[PDB]
Structure 1
Amino acid sequence: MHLTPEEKSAVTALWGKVNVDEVGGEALGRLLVVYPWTQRFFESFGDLSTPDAVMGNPKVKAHGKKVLGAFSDGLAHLDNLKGTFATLSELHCDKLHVDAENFRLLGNVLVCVLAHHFGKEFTPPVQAAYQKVVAGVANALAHKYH
């Protein structure tokens, strides 16, 4: 990343107060509700007919914790997101056929979730650093598409 130590510390520090379970379930569901077309990947999850049915779906909640899980680990390799996500990047391309644009949709969603949760704590400057992280993750994740 091209994060300022100060920017690194802000990311790092807020992350520390994060419940990945709750935040991952909520990021992915909001994703499926704000941008209905990303549901194309989760047909097997069940009923996603409504906000409520999306937010309540356990398969969704559980896929969300798997995703944020992986994201969380990437925050420890902020100086090499590329190498951290190489395997996951090939997977998404070659096995899952997920359009890289989805990586970007999620990131924005994640930032909205963090604001939601942290209110005051999630300041313009703090938001600025997370925007850089989401972008970098999306980039690393898309890096191996061919």
Structure 2
Amino acid sequence: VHLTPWEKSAVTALWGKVNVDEVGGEALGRLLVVYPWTQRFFESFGDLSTPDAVMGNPKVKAHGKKVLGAFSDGLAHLDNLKGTFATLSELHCDKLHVDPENFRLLGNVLVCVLAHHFGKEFTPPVQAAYQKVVAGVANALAHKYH
């Protein structure tokens, strides 16, 4: 959504240190662990029995890098998240049939993962900036639902 000029820079800065592939697998992995019902969409992924299994699942990691790579690209379009994610929105609603609530939940996990990996650097203002980002991305992906 509307971040301030400084918030947009805080986001941009922090993200320059983010290994998208790793944070992607980590974030999606924790989503399946903390909110196990999200696993409903990934039966084909194989072993998702324990946290160590989910986190170590190669399909989970690979899907996580895909999901976060798309999220990453969208950061270059902060002022038009609705437009940049429109196609993905239709796909998640029409083909994938994914409840938008899942996007909000992954957003919660992503923030926890950033806080975790960055520590003190992920300050309250930096968090506020990313809250606007994950909320905007979730609203943008949910927008074309019908």
Q: Shorter chain as normaliser: what TM range?
A: over 0.9
CA offsets, 1:13-35, max 9 Å, x none? Answer: 00000001110000000000000
The percent identity for this pair of structures is 98
For structure 2, list consecutive stretches of 5 or more residues without a partner in the other structure.
Answer: none
Could you tell me how far apart the structure 1 residues matched to 2:108 and 2:35 are? 12
1:141 Cα deviation from its structure 2 partner: 0.2
CA offsets, 1:24-65, max 9 Å, x none? Answer: 000000000000000000000001000010001000000000
1:144 Cα deviation from its structure 2 partner: 0.1
Could you tell me how far apart the structure 1 residues matched to 2:52 and 2:3 are? 37
1:123 Cα deviation from its structure 2 partner: 0.3
Higher helix proportion: 2
1:96 Cα deviation from its structure 2 partner: 0.2
Could you tell me how far apart the structure 2 residues matched to 1:42 and 1:29 are? 11
CA offsets, 1:77-135, max 9 Å, x none? Answer: 00100010000000000000000000000000000000010001100000000000000
The answer to whether structure 1 residue 90 and structure 2 residue 90 are counterparts is yes
Could you tell me how far apart the structure 2 residues matched to 1:76 and 1:120 are? 25
Could you tell me how far apart the structure 1 residues matched to 2:70 and 2:58 are? 18
Could you tell me how far apart the structure 1 residues matched to 2:34 and 2:3 are? 29
Could you tell me how far apart the structure 2 residues matched to 1:128 and 1:96 are? 30
1:11 Cα deviation from its structure 2 partner: 0.5
Could you tell me how far apart the structure 2 residues matched to 1:104 and 1:48 are? 22
Alignment RMSD (CA, Å): 0.4
TM-score (norm 2): 0.99
Could you tell me how far apart the structure 2 residues matched to 1:58 and 1:110 are? 19
For structure 1, list consecutive stretches of 5 or more residues without a partner in the other structure.
Answer: none
Residue matched to 1:104: 104
Could you tell me how far apart the structure 2 residues matched to 1:128 and 1:119 are? 15
